[model samples]
Target: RRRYKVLVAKMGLDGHDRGAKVVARALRDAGFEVVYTGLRQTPEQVAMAAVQEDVDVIGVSILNGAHLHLMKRLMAKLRELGADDIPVVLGGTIPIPDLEPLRSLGIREIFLPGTSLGEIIEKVRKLAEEKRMREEAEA
Candidate 1:
């Protein structure tokens, strides 16, 4: 079976992380190797963790309404650290207005509240597979 290393983080001052924790646990239960960075993580810290953990994907949860600022900074730092290839997925109370902009920033997946865990896991697994195959073909 294919396994994935996924790093999850609660970005910025989002102190209320019950939802994030639940999602992380659900990911774990669905058989992904999940690394949760807990709460109050800066974008740089999360980016660093993604590198150190060598994750296949980075998942972030933000409820502080700083999705635009925080997600943009995280993507920039990932590029700075040469981790721009790692696909990022986000969840939480993201405003509908910012959703398209976020996708255009290369966020591979976004899970709003009430999204099915099965779908999230399936998407992550398939995306990893597709990326791997694409890289192999390129090589």
Candidate 2:
């Protein structure tokens, strides 16, 4: 039985982290090995933390509606750092129009405000499981 690890980040200048913290706590309580990269993060900082932590996923909480700019920069920077395999997910307030573009960048998943925390936790776990299995099979 492998433990799934997730790193949660609050990206950009948004200091309000109650929601992100709640989600992080939920994920941790759900049995994930969680790393919380708290408050006022830049895209680069988030990517760096994810790499250093070697998390299975980097979940970004951006409620100030900066999803488009922030997500794009984070994805690009992560890839540039040779950490493109790390899945980057977005949570919190996001518009319907941006989902497709975010998906196109190959984000692992997205959780909106109305989404179930259980489902999100399950998805992250399954994703890490399947990814590891695939890598093992390949090796």
Candidate 3:
């Protein structure tokens, strides 16, 4: 089978991408093809890229205090693009209080600072496979 392709994007006005790069590299090393969108991406751009790239999972990092706003737009954009079948995962300084709300907004998983790359790899693989299977069923 082909390896999962993940579009890892950095959201909002994030000044740097140090952590995002590490995550992308780790995913690449874990046998997933990763497309790293540069720093400071709008949700609209991210969603369009996810659809055009035909990625299996959409991963994004948000260090700013804009997770809620940005994620809402991204989910809406993905729905508009008809790419909601691709699961989404968020990572960064997310508050515990917002966890449930984010999940309610369609995020499949959220990874805080201490989550391991191995764990991310495992979870993402499961999400990708599940999405594939479900899409196949719909077809």
Candidate 4:
């Protein structure tokens, strides 16, 4: 129970966040600290926040059909901040073709509307565990 930190952010124009809030609450209840960045954030701002908080993992919720654009820049920006390998996951109304490149950039998993919270919590915890292991390696 290291209570690793997680940042849940919504980037770009999509304003809906009911799912994000629900996921954030569930994660906190599961003994992980969650930071929910309210609607309409940028990749740069999000990357900045993730680094500032030093969170173990990042969860992005996108429904604007711009996931690929946002993610490519976000992952690159995250690397610029030197936080590569920090698991970044996404959940939203995504199409089949988008999956290929998303994972190619190291996005651990993509969550859809029908996915169970149990799976989300479990996978996030797994990512966090790996992150801490990497943290330990630096010591």
Please identify which of the two predictions, 1 or 2, would achieve the higher lDDT against the true structure: 1
C-alpha TM-score for every candidate: 0.89, 0.89, 0.94, 0.94
Worst 10 residues of 3 by lDDT: 12-21
Backbone clash pairs for candidate 4 read none
Colliding pairs, model 3 = none
The clash tally of candidate 1 reads: 0
- Candidate 1 regions with alpha-carbon error over 4 angstroms: 134-139
* Model 4 C-alpha lDDT versus the unseen true structure: 0.88
By lDDT, who's the top model here? 3
Q: Please provide, for model 3 over 24-59, each residue's C-alpha lDDT reduced to its tens digit, 9 standing for 90 to 100.
A: 999999899899956678999999999998999999
Whole-model lDDT values for every prediction: 0.83, 0.81, 0.89, 0.88
Candidate order (lDDT): 3, 4, 1, 2
lDDT of 1: 0.83
- Model 2 worst lDDT run, 10 consecutive residues: 130-139
Choose 3 or 4, whichever is better by lDDT.
Answer: 3
| lDDT tens digits, residue span 90-137, model 1 | 988777998999998899989998788878888878876765665567
lDDT of 2 by residue, 66-134 (tens): 787888889989998888877777887667888898889888788888888888888887877775675
Q: Is candidate 2 or candidate 3 better by lDDT?
A: 3
